[PDB]
């Protein structure tokens, strides 16, 4: 069942299982193999693999990774994916002293939004967008990957798992305990990534939940009832929060022009009903001259 794959290296642990670089010994294809040990006396196929396979089969799009095969032994489950040159994380660490050029940045961002809007228009929330789960090729494409924490959402939504999104990319409505959350959380994660590409470091590298909130409060101003009606009534909001003033974005992200600052501010609005959707973000003036440069690898 795996006789035709040769292990090239262990790449890392993602949402669940272990991911390896491997090659098809018959066709030569280089793939990524996600291994999940099942056993039997246990629970069968875990819910993350069931969701990731089922939803990625409904998501055929140039900016979404391809699932090529599923090999479901008795013992283990393997998800076989196309292999891209590398993840955006090693690339960001594979630009930290120089910085990814702006045109590349804008290109990746315009692509990640076209991928994400496709997901949202197919009722899929990703819920773990971060640089390590975004994969770039050598021609200039970037793709959403690792759908292990994804889910199908309903219209209107109900309550979903609370423990979602890696803490640095985690939106304030989850951090404050909102009962409901929806597509806005993915957009918040993408605004954090866009800013990280530009300035060369995580925007809000919070250690803990309280640290993550107070890092967002210091840069963007402690939300109040004028910017986010009802924040002061949220489950985990505390009237004793410090009241910080919002920073100018000419200081938060110095390299950006004003089209960039306006779109980064629309992606990080506090109120999920004011945060820009991926589809409305594609019509933003920042992308008016988007092109598709080739990364330097």
């Amino acid at each position: 069942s795996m006789e035709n794959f040769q292990k090239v290296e262990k790449i890392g642990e993602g949402t669940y299982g272990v991911v390896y670089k491997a090659r098809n010994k018959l066709t030569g294809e280089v793939v990524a193999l996600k291994k999940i040990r099942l056993d039997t006396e246990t629970e069968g196929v875990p819910s993350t693999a069931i969701r990731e396979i089922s939803l990625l089969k409904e998501l055929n799009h140039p900016n979404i990774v391809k699932l090529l095969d599923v090999i479901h032994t008795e013992n283990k489950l393997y998800l076989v994916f196309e292999f891209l040159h590398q993840d955006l994380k090693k690339f960001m660490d594979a630009s930290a002293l120089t910085g990814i050029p702006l045109p590349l940045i804008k290109s990746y961002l315009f692509q990640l939004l076209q991928g994400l809007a496709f997901c949202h228009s197919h009722r899929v929330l990703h819920r773990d967008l971060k640089p390590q789960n975004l994969l770039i090729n050598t021609e200039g494409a970037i793709k959403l990957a690792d759908f292990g924490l994804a889910r199908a959402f309903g219209v209107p939504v109900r309550t979903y798992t609370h423990e979602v999104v890696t803490l640095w990319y985690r939106a304030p409505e989850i951090l404050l305990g909102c009962k409901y959350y929806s597509t806005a959380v993915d957009i918040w994660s993408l605004g954090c990534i866009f800013a990280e590409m530009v300035t060369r470091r995580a925007l809000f590298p919070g250690d803990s939940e309280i640290d993550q909130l107070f890092r967002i409060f210091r840069t963007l101003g402690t939300p109040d009832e004028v910017v986010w009606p009802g924040v002061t009534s949220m489950p985990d909001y505390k009237p004793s929060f410090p009241k910080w003033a919002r920073q100018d974005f000419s200081k938060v992200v110095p390299p950006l022009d004003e089209d960039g600052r306006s779109l980064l501010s629309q992606m990080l609005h506090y109120d999920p009903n004011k945060r820009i959707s991926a589809k409305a973000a594609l019509a933003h003036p920042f992308f008016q001259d988007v092109t598709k440069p080739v990364p330097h690898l």
Binding site: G44, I50, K57, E58, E74, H120, T183
Partner: protein, 258 residues
């Protein structure tokens, strides 16, 4: 209000046609029948109630069972094992906290082992090729409810009751797509509770007029009128609860003036 709601409804309109079971599969099963299926489904409604499962999980489990039975012949004695693995998979897809496998072995009354349930889980996944994200009548209904200003909670519970009654009877409801059943159920509940009619915004949104819903609505009106005489009664018993505003105690309209 929700961003993407129209794209999502259009995409759901396209996936219900690809995810649809084969309408006369029961005439080709050699051992099970529509009345056995009905009993399985009525049992899954009670399982959903015992474990506090979403109704969506019920609707998915039925979608999985019907597709699985579209291409696999099953003996009557393994029909609960199919059903149990399906509810297990629908729970894993849809629930924040799915009951664990031992919970599922247990409610079989120990008819099966854990090893059978897990191997049936793997076969269902193989036959359905892991395509678990299907559209259900529940999903159409919750979108149509966004059009009925202010929301009427009795209308909503009654449309869900009627859409759940359609799951019990493969004959005639395997003929209709979920979006049309949801349409007929919403018209009939609104009508019964307030006398209002399928709304013009739903007509513009779905393309469905009262004339295209007619065939489905005549069937569902008869299903609703004959509910008291049906052999399966867990749905009527579930919808007498105050959580569902007791709508299964309401009287069906004797006619619909169509």
């Amino acid at each position: 209000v929700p961003d993407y709601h129209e794209d999502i409804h259009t995409y759901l309109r396209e996936m219900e046609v690809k995810c649809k079971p084969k309408v006369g599969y029961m005439k080709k099963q050699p051992d099970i029948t529509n009345s056995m299926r009905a009993i399985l489904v009525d049992w899954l409604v009670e399982v959903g109630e015992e474990y506090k499962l979403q109704n969506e999980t019920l609707h998915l489990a039925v979608n999985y069972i019907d597709r699985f039975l579209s291409s696999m012949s099953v003996l009557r004695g393994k029909l609960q094992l199919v059903g149990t693995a399906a509810m297990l998979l629908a729970s894993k897809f849809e629930e924040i906290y799915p009951p664990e496998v031992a919970e599922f072995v247990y409610i079989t009354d120990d008819t099966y082992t854990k090893k059978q349930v897990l191997r049936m889980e793997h076969l269902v996944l193989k036959v359905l090729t892991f395509d678990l994200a299907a559209p259900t009548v529940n999903q159409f209904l919750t979108q149509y409810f966004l059009h009925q200003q202010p929301a009427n909670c009795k209308v909503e519970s009654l449309a869900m009751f009627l859409g759940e009654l359609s799951l019990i009877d493969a004959d005639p409801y395997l003929k209709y797509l979920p979006s049309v059943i949801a349409g007929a159920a919403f018209h009939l509940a609104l009508y019964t509770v307030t006398g209002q009619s399928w709304p013009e915004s739903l007509i513009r949104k779905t393309g469905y007029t009262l004339e295209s819903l007619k065939p489905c609505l005549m069937d569902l009106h008869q299903t609703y009128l004959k509910a008291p005489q049906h052999a399966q009664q867990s749905i009527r018993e579930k919808y007498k609860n105050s959580k569902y505003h007791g709508v299964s105690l309401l009287n069906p309209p004797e006619t619909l003036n169509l």
